[PDB]
């Protein structure tokens, strides 16, 4: 029988990781450049997620305009949220420099009226005469990607009680579960060991085969063949009748972009 | 009970790999500057060169490379042709971007003076003076999917096989092998089929089923696996001792190339 997979899948399974990582500009990059989506989003939804990943914030205001009309939606929260972004990132187009701080004044002037308090105004004004907006404590890991990913998670968490989003198809075949690529990753290099134990022992250990893992390259360098399915098939069905692991991961951290200008023109 | 170390910077290198792969160059370097990964075994000037050509840094690579002019075994004009010609088409691209405050068109006439004595053949150099006329760089016949990115890594490959002869590098553990992480993923949904085997006979299978039902985005079950089937090999008596795989190619997006081509502006302004 022939196995068919699809680089899109993998796609999916590594956007998951680097989600489960933040690492969201390498996740943005990644779905802009495959067009891969891991994830099943309602019309509407899928589009509102594309104008915000995108740095279309007017047209976000206008495309969410019609929910602005009910009682209970808190308009106020939805547009601060979505100038104080636009703000952010025309202030990050500037600080890379007559015109785009014209823009920047124009979206503080804006989003005015729909802060909290008086003092974030004022925090959003003083942001103005730093020279780099980053110079803020509570804007130091500020950048426009995981920006427009938690302003799309807020404006969908808002939005989601007024819009129908559930009415779609079971997620199931369109993402990844959850870790699947580690797992899967994990899964190999266990198959590489069992292979390895079936082939030490037909040709003359318990913890040594644990031990000579090779994530990056494997140590025998093979490919993959039907061999361990195929000799497991052959065994005799009396040896099923007879009878976890502590992985240890290691985090990263990377000590710290101009996506905005995309969007602009 | 023993355990396993595994570092999550050298499964970023299998993705890395796996993005190079599929010319994913954009997303691969967001992958490089976001995590601090870079997937391979370089020197740490090896490492600062990667970095200025990678950044459009063209004049900067010049003068980096500049004290290896002088080595016999060292090519001049090829280096200085192809780092003078990167430089070139990213000025003329940012000169594609654009009022009329057009200094990038001096610019982009400076670099192809620049390169004037370095081209193969004067017919190259017409070529390269025809790129002019153009309104667009990237609708020329020759140039219909030329990538910012994508040449910037082509670029960095060429000088990094030229300069490799000198300032070296620890054996070449730290950069995954070719399509590790395809490879990876496919032994361990061999793996899950061979669980589902295992738990299949001494329970309530065919050779075909286990591989129809395979499955990649979800688990068979989401079955979190450990050493059970490795300890259960482990105990078995001593007497108890191909595959073709059709892979769907993705059909990326043309709105890549169009994204793709302010890059030379993000470096100008870098």
């Known amino acids: 029988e022939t196995v068919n997979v699809k680089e899109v899948e993998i796609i999916k399974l590594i956007l998951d990781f680097l989600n489960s990582k933040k690492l ?32 279309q914030w007017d047209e976000v205001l206008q495309f969410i305009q019609p929910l602005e009309c009910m009682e209970k939606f808190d308009k106020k929260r939805f547009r601060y949220i979505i100038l104080k972004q636009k703000f952010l990132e025309a202030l990050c187009v500037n600080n890379a420099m007559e015109f785009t701080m014209q823009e920047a004044v124009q979206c503080l002037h804006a989003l005015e009226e729909y802060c909290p308090s008086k003092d974030d105004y004022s925090k959003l004004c003083l942001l103005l005469t730093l020279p780099r907006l980053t110079n803020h404590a509570e804007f130091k890991d500020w950048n426009p990607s995981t920006a427009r990913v938690h302003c799309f998670e807020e404006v969908c968490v808002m939005v989601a009680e007024f819009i129908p989003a559930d009415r779609k198809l079971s997620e199931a075949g369109f993402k990844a579960s959850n870790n699947r690529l580690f797992q899967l990753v994990m ?22 085969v644990l031990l000579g893992i090779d994530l990056l390259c494997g140590n025998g360098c093979d490919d993959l063949d039907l061999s ?9 069905s009396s040896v099923f009748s007879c009878a976890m692991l502590n992985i240890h991961v290691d985090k990263l951290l990377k000590p710290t972009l101009l996506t905005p200008l995309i969007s602009k023109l």
């Open 24 to 55: 969201h500009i390498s996740m943005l990059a990644l779905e802009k450049e495959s067009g891969v989506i891991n994830g099943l989003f309602s019309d509407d939804m899928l589009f509102l997620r594309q104008l915000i990943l995108d740095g």
């Open 187 to 208: 899964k190999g290099l266990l198959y590489e060991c069992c292979v390895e134990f079936c082939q030490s022992k037909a040709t003359g250990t318990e913890s040594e």
């Open 228 to 236: 361990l399915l195929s000799w497991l098939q052959n065994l005799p």
